[PDB]
């Protein structure tokens, strides 16, 4: 069972910062992980998969790192709408898993 | 004083007696199973052997050496200084099994969707996506004769540079390898002479019988090149293959196609399918025209420098037919008492013939041993001086004191009886298939099916009885 | 094979379809020892190579390639039709491979 | 087995050989010779030079001058290297055989395939 | 097959190599270096040498590379058989040049260990200040050589090794001074004023002498390790020159360990209780460095070496070592930060320090042949295994193979790595220490008419019908 366990609060942050979420995991899964932002109102939305190609209509702000069993996402330049929550999420499509691909969270931004 | 540094042919100093002789096997047959090795379900023991169609076939002929020989005729040599050694001048190469072809395949072949006329694109993968899929072979004939080993030449999977750091999922390295074919290996079958142990991780692509195995061609060039000619006197070839399937590969590709060759899909063909393909190979109809055995062949001139001299006695045959290679299917029930027919009623088995002839012709011939020809074969190859009686060299001795008598028991010295094992040859650790010339040799032409097809070649009939 | 930042080529492109073209360096024989002949005179004459034969060597089995494109203007079949055509709309373009002559 | 565990690539392997037999010719270059070899290339003629009394001319300076230290004066690849190569647009497979030249054609495996065609054989040592 | 018995004495070469009439020239182009006269300068985070050391007090030892006699070409009526006998090179006319005005080269570093003066005084003061020593700069001494050899000179030091086990009392305690002989590099100084010792395995205060001999070691040739060897290699014409002279006469520190004796002096009073110095360095000068005497630019010729072998060079090699201090100019170089104010400054112009130093060799070689019939061949393997082991008189083993695959692209992922990675010797062995390379692979030429030193050589021995009688006077 490759396990992602992204315990970690986001840390206050202003206008114009730069945040280090990391998300590691267990077994190899190689470069195949996404990440999403969820806005606490509507369905979730995608950024990056892959860990370095982004997805249409989203701007090259965003940054994508990371091989092997650790991972990153910065970015910076906060805006007012980067309210939201943060999940990294694996493609093992392992069958004897329970991922749930969770953890993650963004503090509203002063 | 004087020697020589440049390559001499052997009709420089060997002679050629008239004395003949005539050789030959009796039959030679193997039988077991075409794909893969059948052990119990424990131990490493083979039930029944593996033999098909696509492996090698080395044949290493012992031969007895001639110095042995009593000859009654005690006049046209010395053995003073002189030593004596075999030179064949016939060779054939029999076999007996009807014609025909023979397929094979994978359970679980690796392909994706087939590309030479698609519909609609494609969907997507999933996973485990293989699938059952079997194809006959490229067609090959060849047949070597030597007096060392075949050499033959395959790619493979050597060390990275320790400059850039490597990580899992890389693209393996690549070099040639050369090395010595023994009796067992595959052919190639189309799919290029590359291992595909250590380079095809999942296993599933090529069909089962050269899985996981190395296939190997013989290296032409590089056995032509090689000093002394001992690799070859001679060599035969007939090779066809054409393709006839065009499968589309299923895997992650690598490196991914650069965005300036294609402009950029969107849609339903945003993205792209697997690039790479591979064929399907298949041979063409065999005939009874284009064959290469069944037929005599009379050397006139070797290419090398060595015209047919077999040092050691030995000489080494090898053969490759693929157009013998009909799989038999044969069934056995457990009941027959039933009235209908049930298909969990009978077990299915698959076994492979195999068939082959040797027959030779050997000519005796001499050689005078001066001290400026006796460095020379010291040179070229220095066990055969050793496994002449020749090599000389004197260790006077200090005739060592024996022990106690009483030895077993009480002995002071005790355990002084200590066995040395030297006791070694070279060619020992490849295996291959041999053959026992000791005991068949004959001097009447006219009594054995290829001695008179040698006397018409050159006249001479010697047969007065009236 | 490129790195998409870099010009410098990982991995050449070599296929068995391209052409070969060999450039042979001869040496120039004004400088070589000839054995045994007072053949050459240094003001009145000069050596050239001449050719009299070749032999060229290829080692590898035989064997034949495929090649194709995962995306290729294909609109329909042609050899046996059973009813018209549909139209085409945008992005048509199939996989489909091939062998050269 | 998964799908996703194996990623997949492409190679292709290429052999070659060139061998080759040479034998060289003399030219006696009279007055009518270089005319003709004139016409046809003028670069020929300066393989061999034949064309200048000085092959300096009176206006040539010392004929090399080497600034050797590698890295501190006036730089050593930055002039313009003139005996430029008029092919040198053009890349190709580059091969040097200024060596591997000999002329014992009993060793070789095309040579006594040669000695078979013209006939004869060398002097035998035994 | 029982060789016969070889000669227990050595012999002159003049009985078993050949001379002919065939001759060449081979004379190098020009050979400049330039860069800072005291120190090589590199940057303040690592190694890295921006420019080189240069000064006129090196040693500049040649190499010089033969081409291979064995496929050379010839003019007519120049045959032998590769079976029976080989060729070999021989000089016989040999010069070194230089264009150069003519210089002095002082030195001096600014952390001088000087104490006083002891010429002339009138009371003298024990001092002793913590670090009192002060700049004091000096001249050096003129010397001049040229050795030709097959092989490389070997100059001297005295150094520092391990004494015996049986006393030790201090870390101030005294080496025990042992004489040591090496191989010349190129680089390594000499002076023949201090002399040689190398200064920094043996003093540790590094200030006793100028810093262009502080960080490295000043050796001094023997002539008598290269003269009493059996074969007469490693120098066969020698030409030794040099001059000098005192000048001033100094103080050290004064830690004297090594302490005076009681019974030498008489003891006064007051301040005439104690010790002055005892421990003196004189300063050495090069005067008068006139321009008749120079051993230079004069082209001498060999008829007899000193040793048992003339001029044959063994192995397509010959080595060349000059050393030179009558050129040793110093360029004062200077650039200005800012040109614009009409007033000079302190710090507005930068000054540096450069030398330079410019080379010509020119070569007359001779071909030599040399028959072998079983008997020099026994001589030839016992004088150096690697003069045999440069022809090959055994035939081939039995893979031979076709020599190295020689893959097209070097540097890629697809291939493994390649290229001499375990690096089987065949190579000099002398790579570990280096030289300056003259390459000389198509330098020579059969006529020499038209060469500058080649009508000196013909000039000096017969010209009759040599040169030939192009188009005529009538």
């Known amino acids: ?110 | 004083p004087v020697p020589v540094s440049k390559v001499v042919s052997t009709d420089e100093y060997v002679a050629r007696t008239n004395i003949y002789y005539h050789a030959g096997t009796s039959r030679l047959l193997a039988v077991g199973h075409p794909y893969f090795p059948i052990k119990k379900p424990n131990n490493n023991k083979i039930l029944v052997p593996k033999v098909s169609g696509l492996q090698y076939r080395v044949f290493r002929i012992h031969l007895p050496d001639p110095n042995k020989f009593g000859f009654p005729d005690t006049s046209f040599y010395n053995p003073d200084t002189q030593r004596l050694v075999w030179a064949c001048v016939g060779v054939e190469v029999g076999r007996g099994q009807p014609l025909g072809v023979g397929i094979s395949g994978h359970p679980l072949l690796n392909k994706l969707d087939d590309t030479e006329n698609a519909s609609a694109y494609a969907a997507n993968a999933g996973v485990d996506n293989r699938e059952c899929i079997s194809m006959d072979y490229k067609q090959t004939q060849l047949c070597l004769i030597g007096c060392k080993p075949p050499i033959g030449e395959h790619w493979g999977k050597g060390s990275p540079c320790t400059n850039v750091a490597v990580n899992p999922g890389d693209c393996p390295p690549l070099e040639l390898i050369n090395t010595v074919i023994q009796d067992g290996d595959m052919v190639d079958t189309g799919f290029g002479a590359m291992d595909f142990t250590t380079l095809q991780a999942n296993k599933s692509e090529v069909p089962l019988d050269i899985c996981t195995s190395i296939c190997k061609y013989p290296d032409y060039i590089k056995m032509v090149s090689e000093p002394y000619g001992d690799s070859l006197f001679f060599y035969l070839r007939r090779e066809q293959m054409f393709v006839r399937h065009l499968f589309n590969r299923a895997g992650a590709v690598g490196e991914n196609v650069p965005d300036d060759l294609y402009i950029k899909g969107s849609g339903s063909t945003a993205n792209l399918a697997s690039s790479n393909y591979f064929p399907t190979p298949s041979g063409s109809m065999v005939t009874s025209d284009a064959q290469i055995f069944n037929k005599p062949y009379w050397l006139q001139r070797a290419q090398g420098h060595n015209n047919g001299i077999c040092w050691g006695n030995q000489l080494f045959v090898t053969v490759v037919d693929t157009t013998r290679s009909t799989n038999m299917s044969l069934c056995a029930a457990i009941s027959t008492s039933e009235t209908t027919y049930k298909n969990t009623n009978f077990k299915e088995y698959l076994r492979h013939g195999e068939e082959y002839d040797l027959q030779f012709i050997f000519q005796l011939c001499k050689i005078t041993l001066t001290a400026d020809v006796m460095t020379y074969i010291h040179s070229m190859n220095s066990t055969i001086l050793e496994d002449w009686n020749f090599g000389l060299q004197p260790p006077p001795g200090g005739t060592l004191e024996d022990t106690y008598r009483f030895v077993t028991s009480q002995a002071i010295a005790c355990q002084k009886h200590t066995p040395p094992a030297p006791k070694e040859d070279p060619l020992k650790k490849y295996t291959f298939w041999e053959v026992n010339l000791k005991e068949k040799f004959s001097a009447d032409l006219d009594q054995f099916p290829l001695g008179r097809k040698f006397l018409l070649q050159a006249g001479l009939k010697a047969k007065p009885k009236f």
């Not at chain 1, 945040?19 to 990056?48: D, E, F």
């Open chain 1, 1 to 110: 069972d490759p396990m992602l366990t992204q315990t970690a609060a986001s840390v206050e942050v202003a206008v114009g910062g730069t945040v280090t979420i990391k998300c590691q995991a267990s077994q190899s899964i190689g470069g195949y992980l996404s990440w999403y932002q969820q806005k606490p109102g509507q369905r979730p939305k995608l950024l990056i998969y892959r860990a370095s190609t982004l997805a249409s209509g989203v701007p090259s702000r965003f940054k994508g790192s990371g091989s092997g069993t650790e991972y990153t996402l910065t970015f910076s330049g906060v805006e007012c709408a980067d309210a939201a929550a943060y999940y990294c999420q694996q493609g093992y499509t392992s069958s004897d898993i329970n991922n749930a691909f969770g953890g993650g969270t963004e503090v509203v931004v002063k």
